[PDB]
Design a protein around this ligand. Structure first.
Ligand SMILES: CC(C)Oc1cc(Cl)ccc1CNc1cc(-c2ccccc2)nc2ncnn12
Ligand SMILES: CC(C)Oc1cc(Cl)ccc1CNc1cc(-c2ccccc2)nc2ncnn12
Ligand SMILES: CCCCCCCC/C=C\CCCCCCCC(=O)NCCO
Ligand SMILES: CCCCCCCC/C=C\CCCCCCCC(=O)NCCO
Ligand SMILES: CCCCCCCCCCCCO
Ligand SMILES: CCCCCCCCCCCCO
Ligand SMILES: CCCCCCCCCCCCO
Ligand SMILES: CCCCCCCCCCCCO
Ligand SMILES: CCC/C=C\CCCO
Ligand SMILES: CCC/C=C\CCCO
Ligand SMILES: CCC/C=C\CCCO
Ligand SMILES: CCC/C=C\CCCO
Lengths: 254, 254
């Protein structure tokens, strides 16, 4: 007797499908033409790949939990979603650091070296995504039943709290970065970047705060209500970061 | 008299006494000489006042819980300790940002009167210390029951989680700042900055992590064993930030 899907589960499956479609389009645009090989588009490509992985993981997780039942597969796919979300946030941070460094090297008349540091940032982001996405597989999970399980069933409470700590450190870093970018160029662009930062924060603060204010016995509705904004953020990230470029729009026109 | 204090509380009382003595000396040096009116010395004075308040609060809390029993006085003093620690963190952040901006304006050629930006930072720090140190004297009090007390008995759990969230945002901000200062300045004088940042992280991470990984029924020894480094941080802050100055040391030698 496989569980019958609920409304919220179908909602997350649909959102995962939409995210997968959008980020597949973005990745296909980037990789199809050999023009986009600059270290500026590599970070956008990494973010798009991470979001596409998250969407495909959502769809495959719904399918493998409610259509083709398996117990040793849902845990792996949940780990994959965790890795994809961590990689998405790391790529967002890498895209800001690079953007700040290049306004900074543009109003200082210093030649910029961004051929190796971009590779280092990508390697660090993906290593953090894999090292914070392999814990549910073998290290940190409540499937043993004696590990104070967290709000998410496959994930442990301590692992979730570690993820929240890392996210808040990243949020502080990217609040400083969006605070200096507001000073170097100092008017509508400042408002637009503030709106972008607010859109990023209003989508990830709910879940990353409920992770600390939530208990294992809390209603399952809260998990969906706080995780849906994360999927919405992954949905809107390509629009802000990939379809706002003139070259990508020109490729669309062709 | 009646409570019969344990061996892990006289240590806290003597640590509070040492912190109070050191920061009283620093504040006396700062305020006695009328030459110290620069914004940097104002920030150092604010940090010293916050640490002196923390030490005096520790001593008065020991005296008022273990020598002259009073629940209301104990709660008020615990709120005062929370306010003093929040003000200390805010003053450290203000000192860091002011030092970074001084380096920025020094290695660039733009200068402005920083007599109205330091006042705003001090107002923000000393308004957030009261805003985050008024909750125990307000509805967010756990001694009334039905409030899932945190690792600290008078303080709630949600309040401690909010404090940890704010601290981790501040830690991310000051990790970005201690990386930019490491980039703008640049060779053996940079490891000192790493040592200074360690003398803060290794002191404030234990408690701010145990606030999230701790439970109400957890042993009381953990609270003391993780809050002792927090007192050590306020003990060592004047040595790093006040007795390393030139004018302060010159006045001390006289
Ligand atoms: C304690 C608080 C004020 O510190 C911060 C708070 C947030 Cl939300 C974000 C960032 C910071 C510190 N970064 C910062 C602040 C200011 C600044 C300008 C005007 C008034 C006060 C502060 N200027 C700066 N220039 C380069 N960094 N930077
Ligand atoms: C994801 C990670 C790499 O980002 C950070 C991590 C920490 Cl611990 C602290 C800070 C940042 C981002 N600030 C930063 C990074 C770098 C940089 C230099 C070399 C390699 C990689 C990054 N250069 C910079 N210049 C101005 N800020 N800034
Ligand atoms: C340099 C490295 C930077 C690291 C930054 C880390 C930030 C992480 C924040 C947040 C991490 C979110 C964790 C997602 C949990 C998955 C929930 C799930 O499985 N839902 C199934 C629905 O089907
Ligand atoms: C712009 C504002 C910036 C705010 C930054 C906030 C950081 C807070 C960090 C840490 C908060 C520390 C909380 C102290 C708890 C008191 C424990 C106690 O009472 N022990 C009694 C012993 O006698
Ligand atoms: C930023 C977090 C770095 C330290 C690791 C946090 C996890 C603590 C695990 C506690 C193990 C005892 O159950
Ligand atoms: C814009 C920031 C809003 C964050 C609200 C966080 C809500 C915390 C309560 C989560 C429910 C479980 O306790
Ligand atoms: C980062 C601060 C964001 C606000 C989170 C705390 C707000 C109070 C919610 C308490 C709800 C408990 O049922
Ligand atoms: C420098 C990093 C030190 C982090 C140590 C944090 C350990 C906290 C464990 C608290 C567990 C109480 O249940
Ligand atoms: C450990 C990460 C940093 C190592 C150096 C690589 C980046 C060069 O700027
Ligand atoms: C408290 C908000 C501060 C953000 C930085 C704005 C500086 C503009 O001069
Ligand atoms: C919102 C708090 C700051 C408001 C005043 C602007 C900063 C001073 O230049
Ligand atoms: C990679 C972590 C260290 C951050 C500072 C970068 C220094 C650049 O030379």
């Amino acid at each position: 007797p496989l569980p019958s899907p609920k409304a919220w589960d179908v909602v997350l499956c649909i959102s995962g499908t939409l995210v997968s479609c959008e980020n597949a389009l973005v990745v296909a645009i980037i990789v199809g033409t050999p023009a986009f090989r600059a270290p500026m588009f590599l970070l956008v490509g990494s973010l798009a790949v991470a979001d596409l992985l998250a969407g495909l993981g959502l769809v495959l997780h719904f399918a493998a939990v409610f259509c083709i039942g398996s117990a040793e597969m849902s845990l792996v796919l949940v780990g994959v979603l965790a890795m994809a979300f961590t990689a998405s946030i790391g790529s967002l941070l890498a895209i800001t650091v690079d953007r700040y460094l290049s306004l900074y090297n543009a109003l200082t008349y210093y030649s910029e070296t961004t051929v190796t540091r971009t590779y280092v940032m990508l390697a660090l982001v993906w290593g953090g995504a894999l090292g914070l996405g392999l814990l549910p597989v073998l290290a940190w999970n409540c499937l043993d039943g004696l590990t104070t399980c967290g709000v998410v069933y496959p994930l442990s409470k301590n692992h979730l709290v570690v993820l929240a700590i890392a996210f808040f450190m990243v949020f502080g870093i990217m609040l400083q970065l969006y605070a200096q970018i507001c000073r170097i160029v100092c008017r509508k662009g400042i408002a637009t970047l503030a709106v972008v930062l607010g859109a990023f924060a209003a989508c990830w603060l709910p879940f990353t705060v409920y992770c600390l204010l939530g208990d294992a016995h809390s209603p399952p509705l809260y998990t969906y209500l706080t995780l849906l904004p994360a999927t919405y953020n992954s949905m809107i990230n390509p629009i802000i970061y990939a379809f706002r470029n003139q070259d990508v729009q020109k490729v669309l026109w062709a």
